[PDB]
Amino acid sequence: CGETCFGGTCNTPGCSCTWPICTRDGLPV
Secondary structure, X not given: OXXXXXXXXXXOOOOEEEXXXXXXXXXXX
8 A cells, every 4th residue: 555554544545554654455555
């Protein structure tokens, strides 16, 4: 997803906040 969710939030849709990095179904892409 290429986005971090330090505050448990991400702009990129469909990204699971795998604190502190959002993953696209497990993949931090």
